[PDB]
Amino acid sequence: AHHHHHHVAVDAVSFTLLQDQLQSVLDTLSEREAGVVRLRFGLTDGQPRTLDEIGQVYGVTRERIRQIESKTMSKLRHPSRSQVLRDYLDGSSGSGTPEERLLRAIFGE
Amino acid sequence: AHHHHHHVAVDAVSFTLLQDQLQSVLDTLSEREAGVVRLRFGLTDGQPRTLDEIGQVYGVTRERIRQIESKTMSKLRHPSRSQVLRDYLDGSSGSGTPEERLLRAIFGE
Amino acid sequence: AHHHHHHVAVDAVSFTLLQDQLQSVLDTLSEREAGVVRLRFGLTDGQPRTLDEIGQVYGVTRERIRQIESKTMSKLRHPSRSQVLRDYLDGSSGSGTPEERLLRAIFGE
Amino acid sequence: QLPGPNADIWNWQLQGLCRGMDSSMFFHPDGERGRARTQREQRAKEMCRRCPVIEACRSHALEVGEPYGVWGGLSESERDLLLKG
Amino acid sequence: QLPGPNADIWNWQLQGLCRGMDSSMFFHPDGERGRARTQREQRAKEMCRRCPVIEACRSHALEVGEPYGVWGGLSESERDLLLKG
Amino acid sequence: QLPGPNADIWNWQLQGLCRGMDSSMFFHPDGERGRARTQREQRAKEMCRRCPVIEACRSHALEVGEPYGVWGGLSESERDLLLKG
Ligand code: SF4
Ligand code: SF4
Ligand code: SF4
Ligand code: NI
Ligand code: NI
Ligand code: NI
Ligand code: NI
Ligand code: NI
Ligand code: NI
Ligand code: NI
């Protein structure tokens, strides 16, 4: 109900990535940008799509999908909204979760 | 069916906390104590409650809820039953899980 | 839908073990071998079975079940198919998952 | 170890004599008044007075702070009197 | 830190003046043409020209590479002209 | 590395010649008797006799212990005879 998460390592740094916090990241994108992300990386069904397959979905060229992807990555890293990304990438901390509050009560302060 | 768990870090120590082992911790409390814990930290629905909101649930004062919370924390740390807490906090070990038994069979001894 | 996983530590080495990758490991076994594994370690329902209980299931002796288990472990470690085991034991890497692809897009290269 | 002031409780709790018992010998049900209360406390204390880690238990409860329960052979009110007067 | 070339963006982004704002002040909707486009850019730039980390923002966008958005008080086309000519 | 005695198998298995094959060339179906059995073994062995890590495979099976399968160009019974007599 909130538990779905993934463990990943990229260049020997580890991440715990919560589905709910990914949804908060995607919510900052346009509907088409978020859909391109979901199709490109296989978030919808585990299966990545090619740029041409995604362009078929949205009625645009492969090159426009490439540009949509590029614009999305710039959007996700922009300082205006990049705290949502920071929160997602720091999922291993459990900050603001019921269990972290409980443990702080048990341990004091 | 047993997988729901949370990753949390408190003062740079990390924990893996299984919902089934949390249920075993709560089972050692009275029904009202366990309910206060669930409401206070948002285990029921992700949303913490104030002491006054919880007192409304149980028909008691905010101060009685504060005392119920305090008594609960003493109960959870008492040496009589604190092994259930130890087991919960050591969830990253996977001790007594099907997968840990399988891996010990594959690895030997 | 792919998230079910377990965290285990064996002799101070930690593993993240995905149910989908365990299924790929079991798929390389015979139906009876995979069933013996599931019953012996409690993968079906959290509850390990004795060798005699498993022999009752398959109509064979306790000693034949011991031999089936031994043969299974040799099969899982044989160099012919041991990449499926390697993939399972390396679940903490998240390699080939949607989230790892997404993070590599965000981070570059 | 654990974070916070309770960092080291596992150093001694594994030797406590009460380790198997239900928490009911050491904590009063919410409503309890009169005879029952005191009879619960003295039963708990008979165990503490046989326990090998009574000193560590007592020290944890008084110095780190446990407001509820019998710890170290001391009742809740005994500890409250010692600490606050 | 983060892996890859964006390893160090958190060093400066926490001081950016735009930190609370919707990304719409800094990125053009897909269809945008004429007046609207330029009026969006100059609004974004008025903020950058007040921002304490404008130099780090500009340097990230030009040297590490951000093809879209207003960064460091520079538009997309300004940066494309500087980098590719 | 892995825990236990199989700690180092990945050092050599990635070079094994059988790496792509179904385990059926190296393990007998449960019921197998007569001709089929031996014909399976000699096929597996023809591969081992071409394999670059045959020595490491053979050593793992005999010294660390693999009761089932063809390893290192040796059958199950060959290894059982060598180890137990
Ligand atoms: S002193 Fe009493 S409460 Fe403390 S561990 Fe010993 S028996 Fe338990
Ligand atoms: S320079 Fe502009 S885009 Fe960069 S952080 Fe400052 S206000 Fe935001
Ligand atoms: S010696 Fe035979 S069983 Fe061992 S890795 Fe080589 S081919 Fe495979
Ligand atoms: Ni959930
Ligand atoms: Ni939960
Ligand atoms: Ni589960
Ligand atoms: Ni499971
Ligand atoms: Ni996990
Ligand atoms: Ni899943
Ligand atoms: Ni997922």
Residue numbers in the entry:
A (entry chain B), B (entry chain B), C (entry chain B): 439 to 547
D (entry chain A), E (entry chain A), F (entry chain A): 6 to 90
Which lines from the publication concern this structure?
WhiB3 plays a crucial role in the survival and pathogenesis of Mtb. It binds to the conserved region 4 of the principal sigma factor (σA4) in the RNA polymerase holoenzyme to regulate gene expression like other known Wbl proteins in Mtb. These structures reveal that the WhiB3:σA4 complex shares a molecular interface similar to other structurally characterized Wbl proteins and also possesses a subclass-specific Arg-rich DNA-binding motif.
Two crystal forms were observed from the same crystallization drop, with the larger crystals in the P43212 form and the small ones in the R3 form. The R3 structure contains one WhiB3:σA4-βtip complex per asymmetric unit, as the trimer axis coincides with the crystallographic threefold axis. The crystal structures of the WhiB3:σA4-βtip complex in the P43212 and R3 forms are essentially identical except for the N-terminal loop region, with an average Cα root-mean-square deviation of 0.27 Å for WhiB3 and 0.42 Å for σA4, respectively. The R3 structure was used for the following structural analysis of the WhiB3:σA4-βtip complex because of the better-defined electron density of the N-terminal residues (aa 6–13) in WhiB3. In the R3 crystal structure, the N-terminal residues 6 to 16 of WhiB3 interact with both σA4 and βtip outside the Fe–S cluster binding pocket. The buried surface area between WhiB3 and σA4-βtip (1075.3 Å2) is significantly larger than that of the WhiB1:σA4 complex (645 ± 27 Å2) and WhiB7:σA4-βtip complex (576 ± 3 Å2) (see Experimental procedures). The net increase in the surface contact between WhiB3 and σA4-βtip is mainly attributed to the N-terminal residues 6 to 16 of WhiB3, which has a buried surface area of 372.1 Å2 with σA4-βtip. In particular, L7, P8, I14, and W15 of WhiB3 form a hydrophobic core with both σA4 and βtip. The 4Fe-4S cluster binding pocket in WhiB3:σA4-βtip is enclosed, similar to that of WhiB1:σA4 and in contrast to the solvent-accessible cluster in the case of WhiB7:σA4-βtip.
